[PDB]
Structure formats: structure tokens, C-alpha cells
Amino acid sequence: DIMELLKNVDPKEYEKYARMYGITDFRGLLQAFELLKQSQ
């Protein structure tokens, strides 16, 4: 669960997550952060 992991990651650290987990869809990560905001 990416979002669950992103709970421990800042919305400005989407690049860090991408580099660590090898994510090419950085926009999906940004959207995931927005989804977390909705769940918040």
C-alpha cells in the first residue's frame, strides 16, 4: 500500500519516495498525497 507508506512521507518528499522505491509515476504519488488529504 503506497499511500500507507506515504503517511510517513512529506508531500514535498514525493521525489525521495520515488527514488527509494523506484517510482516513475511521480504524479500518481502526488495524487496519492491528495487522496491522503481526503482521508484526513
Cell of 16: 525521495
Identify whether the C-beta of residue 27 lies closer than 8 Å to the C-beta of residue 15: no
Residue 1 is classified by DSSP as -
Q: Name the residue range of residue 19's domain.
A: 2-39
Judge contact between 19 and 9, C-beta under 8 A. no
| Terminal Cα distance for the chain, rounded | 16
32-36 LR contacts (CB < 8 Å, sep 24+)? 32/2, 32/3, 32/6, 33/6, 35/3, 36/3, 36/6, 36/7
1-36 burial, b for 16+ CB within 10 Å, e for fewer?
eeeeebeebeeeebeebeeeeeeeeeeebeebbeee
C-alpha cell at 28: 500518481
C-alpha cell at 26: 511521480
Number of domains in the chain: 1
Amino acid at position 2, single letter: I
What is the grid cell recorded at 32? 496519492
